[PDB]
Ligand binder design. Structure first.
Ligand code: NMN
Ligand code: 1X8
Ligand code: NA
Ligand code: NA
Length: 321
């Protein structure tokens, strides 16, 4: 009647299972191409649960079991941002975007490539990893202090609990509610006699500021991550490389990005995705245009409030189209 695993064997087996299950969940949710069928995932998941039941000391923050929800907070702790979560300078016309490029070329002394990306209209978040393990999820708040919503963000399946390398990084992006889930949620709320959400941003914000993680788990949320606070531990030397690297290490990144070799290509991208806007399952409020090379971003620097190497081109609001 002796238990088959010693503590030491269970510890090693738990490590293997968490790594394997995190890999399979990433394939399933983020890559959308699972290498194993659900019953194989479920079988390994149950094995891990049984180990954690027998040996509770083996429950770690990177464990897949820590997603399910159940935890209920009394309130959110403040989450300071040591590196500010800044807002970009804005543009609205062709004139503004070509003027941006003129100012960039004035500073750099040559034409420059731009990394062009969709400005995702959700709740801005920062995800902190230490030794490749998810340790803190935070809202932007005012950009200097937000709310610690780590447990809520664990329920968001696209958020990785571990990375493919044991680096310490602070990763910035957006958490949003897909449009199709937003409209379904409002109908559900209508039927439950609850106030409806004005728009998907409010629904994502409301969802992530619930204290009971079980309720947050019921909501459908997703993420796109696009940069980090400090590139030290990273190998990327350009914004486009940065996006590929974040993707490689486990983050969901937006597939619509494009590296533009001229301002004309930048303008054509803006036009392309203004048209495509309606066809996307997530809301965007514009296009972000960034000087691609980090050496050049470093040369341009920042103003008192914003980068001099990036601009946000704003569309009309989602309600208006
Ligand atoms: N086939 C896979 O690799 C894989 C990975 C994660 C979740 N799932 C499925 O998603 C559902 C929810 O599972 P989780 O709560 O662990 O994310 C289950 O039905 C599970 O089978 C499948
Ligand atoms: N404030 C900012 O710097 C940014 C804000 C956002 C946003 N809301 N969505 C996407 C991007 C992106 N991929 O660059 C950025 S950059
Ligand atoms: Na959910
Ligand atoms: Na359209």
């Amino acid at each position: 009647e002796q238990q088959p695993l010693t503590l030491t064997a269970a510890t090693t087996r738990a490590q293997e299972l968490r790594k394997q299950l995190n890999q399979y969940s990433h394939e399933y949710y983020v890559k959308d191409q699972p290498s194993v069928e659900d019953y194989v995932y479920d079988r390994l998941y149950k094995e891990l649960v049984d180990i954690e039941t027998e040996f509770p000391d083996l429950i770690t923050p990177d464990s897949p079991t820590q997603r399910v929800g159940g935890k209920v907070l009394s309130g959110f702790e403040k989450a300071p941002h040591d590196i500010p979560m800044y807002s970009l300078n804005d543009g609205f016309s062709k004139e503004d975007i070509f003027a941006f490029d003129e100012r960039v070329r004035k500073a750099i002394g040559k034409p420059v490539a731009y990394c062009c990306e969709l400005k995702i209209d959700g709740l801005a978040i920062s995800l902190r990893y230490e030794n490749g393990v998810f340790v803190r999820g935070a809202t932007r708040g005012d950009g200097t202090v937000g709310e610690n919503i780590t447990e809520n963000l664990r329920t968001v399946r696209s958020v990785p609990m571990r990375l493919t390398e044991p680096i310490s990084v602070e990763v910035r992006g957006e958490c949003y509610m897909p449009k199709q889930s937003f409209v379904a949620l409002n109908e559900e709320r209508e039927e439950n006699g609850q106030d409806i959400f004005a728009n998907p941003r409010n629904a994502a914000a409301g969802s992530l500021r619930q204290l009971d993680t079980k309720i947050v788990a019921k909501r459908n949320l997703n993420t796109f991550l696009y940069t980090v606070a400090d590139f030290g531990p990273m190998k990327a030397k350009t914004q486009f490389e940065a996006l590929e690297e974040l993707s490689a290490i486990g983050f969901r990144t937006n597939p619509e990005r494009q590296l533009c070799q001229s301002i004309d290509e930048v303008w054509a991208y803006i036009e392309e995705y203004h048209e495509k806007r309606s066809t996307l399952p997530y809301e965007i409020d514009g296009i972000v245009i960034k000087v691609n090379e980090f050496a050049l971003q470093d040369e341009l620097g920042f103003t008192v409030k914003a980068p001099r190497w990036a601009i946000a081109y704003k569309f009309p609001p989602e309600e208006a189209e």
